[PDB]
Amino acid sequence: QISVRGLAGVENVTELKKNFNRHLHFTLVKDRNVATPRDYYFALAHTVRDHLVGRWIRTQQHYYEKDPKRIYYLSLEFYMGRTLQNTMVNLALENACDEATYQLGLDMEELEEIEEDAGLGNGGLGRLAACFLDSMATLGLAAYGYGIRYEFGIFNQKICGGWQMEEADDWLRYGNPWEKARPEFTLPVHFYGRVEHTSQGAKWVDTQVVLAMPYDTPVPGYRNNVVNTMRLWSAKAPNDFNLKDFNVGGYIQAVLDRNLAENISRVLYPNDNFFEGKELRLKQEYFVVAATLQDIIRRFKSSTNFDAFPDKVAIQLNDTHPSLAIPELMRVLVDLERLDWDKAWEVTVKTCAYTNHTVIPEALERWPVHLLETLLPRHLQIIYEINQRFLNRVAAAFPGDVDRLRRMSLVEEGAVKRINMAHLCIAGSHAVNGVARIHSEILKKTIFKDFYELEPHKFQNKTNGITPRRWLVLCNPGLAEIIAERIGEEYISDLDQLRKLLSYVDDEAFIRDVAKVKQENKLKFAAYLEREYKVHINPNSLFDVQVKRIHEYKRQLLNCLHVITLYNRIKKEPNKFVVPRTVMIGGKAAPGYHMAKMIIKLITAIGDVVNHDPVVGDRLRVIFLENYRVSLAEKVIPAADLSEQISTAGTEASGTGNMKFMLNGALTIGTMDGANVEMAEEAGEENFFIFGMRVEDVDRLDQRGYNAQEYYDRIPELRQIIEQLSSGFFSPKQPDLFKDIVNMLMHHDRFKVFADYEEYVKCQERVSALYKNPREWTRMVIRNIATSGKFSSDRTIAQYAREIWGVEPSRQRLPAP
Amino acid sequence: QISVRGLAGVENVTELKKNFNRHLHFTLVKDRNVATPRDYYFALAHTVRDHLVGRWIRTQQHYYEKDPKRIYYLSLEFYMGRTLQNTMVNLALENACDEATYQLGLDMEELEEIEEDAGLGNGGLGRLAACFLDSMATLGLAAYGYGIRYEFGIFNQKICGGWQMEEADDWLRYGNPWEKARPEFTLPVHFYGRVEHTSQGAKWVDTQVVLAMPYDTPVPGYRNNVVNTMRLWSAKAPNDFNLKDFNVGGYIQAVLDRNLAENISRVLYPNDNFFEGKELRLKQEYFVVAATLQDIIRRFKSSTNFDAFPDKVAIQLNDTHPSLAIPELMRVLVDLERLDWDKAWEVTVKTCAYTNHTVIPEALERWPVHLLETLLPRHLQIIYEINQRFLNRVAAAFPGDVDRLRRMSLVEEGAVKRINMAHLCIAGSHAVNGVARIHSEILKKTIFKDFYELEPHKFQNKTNGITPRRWLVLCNPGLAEIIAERIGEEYISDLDQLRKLLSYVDDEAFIRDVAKVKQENKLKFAAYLEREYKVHINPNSLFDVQVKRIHEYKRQLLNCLHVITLYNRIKKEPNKFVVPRTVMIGGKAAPGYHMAKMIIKLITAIGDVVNHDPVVGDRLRVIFLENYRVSLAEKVIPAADLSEQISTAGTEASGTGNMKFMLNGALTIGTMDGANVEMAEEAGEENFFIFGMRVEDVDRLDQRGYNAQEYYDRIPELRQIIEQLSSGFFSPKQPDLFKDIVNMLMHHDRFKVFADYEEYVKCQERVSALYKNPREWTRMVIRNIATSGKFSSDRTIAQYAREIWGVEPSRQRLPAP
Ligand SMILES: *Cc1c(COP(=O)(O)O)cnc(C)c1O
Numbered sequence A, B: 001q002i003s004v005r006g007l008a009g010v011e012n013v014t015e016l017k018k019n020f021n022r023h024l025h026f027t028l029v030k031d032r033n034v035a036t037p038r039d040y041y042f043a044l045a046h047t048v049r050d051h052l053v054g055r056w057i058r059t060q061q062h063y064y065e066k067d068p069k070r071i072y073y074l075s076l077e078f079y080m081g082r083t084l085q086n087t088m089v090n091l092a093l094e095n096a097c098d099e100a101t102y103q104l105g106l107d108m109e110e111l112e113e114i115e116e117d118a119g120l121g122n123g124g125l126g127r128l129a130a131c132f133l134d135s136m137a138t139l140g141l142a143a144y145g146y147g148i149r150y151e152f153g154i155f156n157q158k159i160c161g162g163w164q165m166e167e168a169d170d171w172l173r174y175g176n177p178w179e180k181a182r183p184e185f186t187l188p189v190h191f192y193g194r195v196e197h198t199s200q201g202a203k204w205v206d207t208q209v210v211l212a213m214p215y216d217t218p219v220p221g222y223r224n225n226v227v228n229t230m231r232l233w234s235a236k237a238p239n240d241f242n243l244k245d246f247n248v249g250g251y252i253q254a255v256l257d258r259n260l261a262e263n264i265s266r267v268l269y270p271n272d273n274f275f276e277g278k279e280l281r282l283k284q285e286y287f288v289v290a291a292t293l294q295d296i297i298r299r300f301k302s303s304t305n306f307d308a309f310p311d312k313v314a315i316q317l318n319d320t321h322p323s324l325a326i327p328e329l330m331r332v333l334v335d336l337e338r339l340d341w342d343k344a345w346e347v348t349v350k351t352c353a354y355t356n357h358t359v360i361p362e363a364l365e366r367w368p369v370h371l372l373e374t375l376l377p378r379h380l381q382i383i384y385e386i387n388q389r390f391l392n393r394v395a396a397a398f399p400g401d402v403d404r405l406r407r408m409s410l411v412e413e414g415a416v417k418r419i420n421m422a423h424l425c426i427a428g429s430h431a432v433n434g435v436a437r438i439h440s441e442i443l444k445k446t447i448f449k450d451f452y453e454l455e456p457h458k459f460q461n462k463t464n465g466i467t468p469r470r471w472l473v474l475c476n477p478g479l480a481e482i483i484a485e486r487i488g489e490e491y492i493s494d495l496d497q498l499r500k501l502l503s504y505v506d507d508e509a510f511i512r513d514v515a516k517v518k519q520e521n522k523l524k525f526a527a528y529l530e531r532e533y534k535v536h537i538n539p540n541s542l543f544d545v546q547v548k549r550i551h552e553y554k555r556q557l558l559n560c561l562h563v564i565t566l567y568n569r570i571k572k573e574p575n576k577f578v579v580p581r582t583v584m585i586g587g588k589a590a591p592g593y594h595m596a597k598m599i600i601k602l603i604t605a606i607g608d609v610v611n612h613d614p615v616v617g618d619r620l621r622v623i624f625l626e627n628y629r630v631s632l633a634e635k636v637i638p639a640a641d642l643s644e645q646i647s648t649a650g651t652e653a654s655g656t657g658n659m660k661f662m663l664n665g666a667l668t669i670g671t672m673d674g675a676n677v678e679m680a681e682e683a684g685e686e687n688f689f690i691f692g693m694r695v696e697d698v699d700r701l702d703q704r705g706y707n708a709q710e711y712y713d714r715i716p717e718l719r720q721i722i723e724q725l726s727s728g729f730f731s732p733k734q735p736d737l738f739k740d741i742v743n744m745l746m747h748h749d750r751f752k753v754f755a756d757y758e759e760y761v762k763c764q765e766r767v768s769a770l771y772k773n774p775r776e777w778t779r780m781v782i783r784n785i786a787t788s789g790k791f792s793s794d795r796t797i798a799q800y801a802r803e804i805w806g807v808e809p810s811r812q813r814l815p816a817p
């Protein structure tokens, strides 16, 4: 039992064992003779859950009594992962439960592996929302996460014949012990219908009604007894009209068709940085917004002058997905509360804040007018009015600038009329932020330049972060322990204290412990790999890892080119020494993203060749990590030596995986993109492996005109690789299998893979040179870990609180349980 | 607190209050400040449930140890109603819980009204299965009820403008504390596909797979610590093929289409005594049978010579709904276990028993061959083989009788080929029974005459019954108490002891108590009527009740004719004295049964006229009891004076509502149909109000030819009624509203309403004459209650056990909890 895992004191262990047996009997209705590992997992989950309830109830009672300003984080994604260990960590019950289960003859770590991941997110955006919820609770903010309870989260990825196969993530199959259904708080949501203009105001009538049933999940802060709530809405059909609309096609059919309204919360769209304008997605977006706003207003009216609304409520929009909150708030205030437009607008603007997460054009939401027209007629009218008044403001500030007017319009003209949701968000929010310094600057200099010129005060930066609880203490206890031994435990909730480790960079003892922990993590992971999936990696090789969603801008393809280069160099000089490497690439491709699926096949195709070449031996291995998800991230990241963050400069808004690797003892090879810039700034550029074009360089190349052929003609090693791909060297039975990839690299590569190839290969050689010197590699690692403090989501949330929401974070512990 | 409700002893009450608060806090996550009545209901339900778990686990462990013969009751319907009070009654916790909640400042009776009915049945057939489960547990049989967990049970009936409106019964909305999901025991069910004949046997391949997930509900016996199980299957789509069948229409659509396989357990077909040959119904029937048989075999292989199978297993088929169990058992034994046909057939016949519940032709299941052909190709082949071998047996016993062969064939020739499931059941079962003596005789003399001649030994009778726990102790505690005061509590599990009450028929004290209880029940119900539904009945009037499903054979129309007769007689002689009556009619009509819906409208239309006629006053009231269901039956039956059981002789197989009224102190007016015959036999015909044609009389009339016109021409009062209906007297704004009803009564009444009119009216006059003499009315009531013992489902189950299943019932209490 390690120090940071809490105390396992007599009374506690005895009490836990007692309650464990209680739940196994009464809750699961089983006895020790027929109980399976899953039964034991659930008995433990219910036992831990019990310790959470008391504090959950008083935290909420507390907010009712003190009535502080409330923060509502709206997101269509919350990538939570597993909850058991995280709950134990935050409640300081890990060692007690470990002992209690040990005495019951059970291995707690094998029980934890039974829990299903709550994968209600695609990647970075969804996981950021999860880290934020943790930090808001740890900082004592009266915050509520609001989203959708998808019955099917991100699909489980299977690799068959080297190809990605998708299968439904039935995560609720065995039940979810963490959520609490609150059917009593069900709210109605309206769709379709038409607008009627009456004597006093407009009325939205003849609508289809769908019920929103909330499920609450507790979010515990770190050892402060604060337990906030994440409320997820589930779609339910009403019992009437969805059957009472008589004169029709039969009783049975009417009941079966209920699964037409309930499909709204059925599944998560599996896209990462890609907009898909489907009606079902729009319905989901309005569903979460409509239900949430009614809940917010209801809670407020308990706290009718809405002038104080902005003082008691803050609504944060995670991307444009929940952008309809702006016109919906206006609708309720104008149509239902009967406030004058101007007054309602003032309240709305002061209440909403918008966070932008990307500059990629194919990721921006632009909804066709005909869709909004049919599904939400009243909102479309409100949007037109907002646009009209906004453009009048622009025209007054920039007289005669007619092109500026069309550029800033919320309504985009063309083949099909569309509403630019990003423009909607900027107009209706008092604050707009990017997620990394370089991203926020790009927003002001390019994409939102016109808006910045009109309202410079709205634009801000809030560099992303990750929670040190899940991403250090939970997944890397070994490291957290050796750190605690030197500087105490205070850093867990004050990551900046990791800087104290700088005075240990020359400590022979510490250097040895740091390296020891990494080695243990690698052996641990190397074992998991065989135990599950039967694979052959060598724990002595350099663990080169690139895990994140598969996307062309992420450039998994550049990594592939390097891997093939290494392979060719070995075959050319077989008996020459090279630092052994285990290259691991993992990530999911969106089901309808062809090129992404082709990239996965190439990676496995390369492994098929490299992993079975006698001459290579155990000097180079290429493994594709199947079903990359939060729980897998918690295993591979602590075991990594090299972190690949190689997106084309200017494409990765921030990145968060980069921060996770830095905190866990891996060195980083990457481009000056997103948060990589600030990470290098914090650690010192001489302690980072930076390469490739900077944003300025990419722009030059575009002015010039990118011609991949040039690089192909002047770089022999690159030419060889392309010829191997084209000739079928990696696909014997299908010679032209990778023709699309080659065609893209050569004629229409929007991300300039070839442009950074030479610089990349050279930088990688420097990485291999340092790995040869264990002591110096580890000292550089220490300098990275020691300067990763700025990337704690606690820092990020404290900035949102003070600069956007107008609330003060607190580390004060709540009056016990 | 009344005696029969158990003890409320210090330690128990203290413990219950403690656990109540425990669940309210930890389970519901609420505190006394925000808890609603529903929250309190759930805290109490979980508290009572806890006392059930211990015994449930040891009962099952007990069956595993002693390995007795097991009884499997297969039914597509289980009309359970509410579970809270029933559980308390059977565990002897009613007074303790009453006191415990009282001390917590809560009214337990108002909490009980919050529980939703588990309406997984249509009427008599489904409720019989529920009473049987109770009796099997009370008699210590190792029995399991197997059915389907419909997410939508029988629709909730609303009356709008006098018409029936249907709305979805979302009974699981707030959760079900009584069931326990057992996802670990999920089993696959196959559909479609094709048959392949290989070297060694036939193979069913290329099928669609649907998963069957079981949910277990505890069934406690009466104070014997026995807790049996009712396992209900829920449909689940697999995560693969229902997504892995690549090369198709999109990821999102594939996930949404999962609600194509899961629709199997979505809703209960709302038909009572009416066959609807839809594919979805056939899928439900096979779904329950396939999942159940695999579960049975699996449990057996734990108990490979299947020769002992019939000694360890008994399968009871409730009607033909689960008839596919016969060919499915053969399929598994022949195709999977590789037993020779003859051996497999011997086992199947000795294992299965069939109970027939009706002789109405439109209720008999006859599935089109093309349906079975496409959905279950292997089963169709097995059915043909069974038929072939059965007909060879018939041909050998009755040489040259070619018409007998076509009459007995399982395959029905004609416009469309169909399989007669009843013939299938008789051929593949070792016992076939009717549900009342007269019904069982009709089966042998008519419908199944040919089969009886071939195998006389298979035909039996098992008169239906009702459980005295729910239908006396639970719904009429007042009566159970005054009975217990005189003869003890032993009768609750030995109803025959009620005969001792015969020696109290002249007891002035008892006569007074009996009448007092009825009066209290009527006041109680008269109040409920106003509290809910705002209505005006008078507690001093005779409560004339007819509650059951609306159907032409049940003759609610004959009752209507009498009601109109009374009304007309009053209008003719306003100032003449007549015994005051409150006529109550209630019941649901199947959504697609036009005539049934028209009958409901007529009843309310009559009330509209009669209830607002100044001259009538409070002498006659016509009320339509909305949403008749089990919970409503528990309220109205104890309050009834007159029970209407007036089906056309030979149409009501047994009836069970008739038994409920008899046990609760109501006199009966009825035809010699179903169990009415045996009830009159037991009580003495001079203590029953019998009228109308007997079965023999109906047959004569059919030989003759039924001509309604004759009765219309010779009965002035009847003529007047028909003319009032035709002229629009009961539908002013729609003069011909009831044209269909009149047309039917006059030209195509299959149930001869007019033929029994005169006899009915006269009998009703005799009922009014006796009601005028309180003392004599009550003495006759006592003679009915005292002779209702034979109708306890404990008697019924004991007979099934000894004469069909080959097992001995036991009243021995299980070794405590
Ligand atoms: C942290 C995380 C991400 C984000 O990784 P990036 O490299 O920033 O894209 C994606 N998926 C999972 C499961 C994560 O844990």
Ligand SMILES: *Cc1c(COP(=O)(O)O)cnc(C)c1O
Pocket: B122, B123, B124, B127, B547, B548, B549, B628, B629, B630, B633, B654, B655, B656, B657, B658, B660
């Ligand atoms: C007992 C019962 C029935 C059966 O009544 P019959 O008059 O035999 O048709 C039908 N419905 C409910 C809810 C019952 O309690």
Ligand SMILES: CC(=O)N[C@@H]1O[C@H](CO)[C@@H](O)[C@H](O)[C@H]1O
Pocket: A124, A125, A128, A272, A273, A319, A357, A358, A363, A435, A464, A652, A653, A654, A655, A656, A674
């Ligand atoms: C649309 C979307 O998911 N954008 C992503 O948001 C996360 C969290 O801010 C960033 O780290 C990532 O670089 C950016 O691509």
Ligand SMILES: CC(=O)N[C@@H]1O[C@H](CO)[C@@H](O)[C@H](O)[C@H]1O
Pocket: B124, B125, B128, B272, B273, B319, B357, B358, B363, B435, B464, B652, B653, B654, B655, B656, B674
């Ligand atoms: C098909 C069907 O529901 N038949 C019914 O079965 C119940 C229970 O046996 C009988 O009481 C009733 O008279 C009979 O009509």
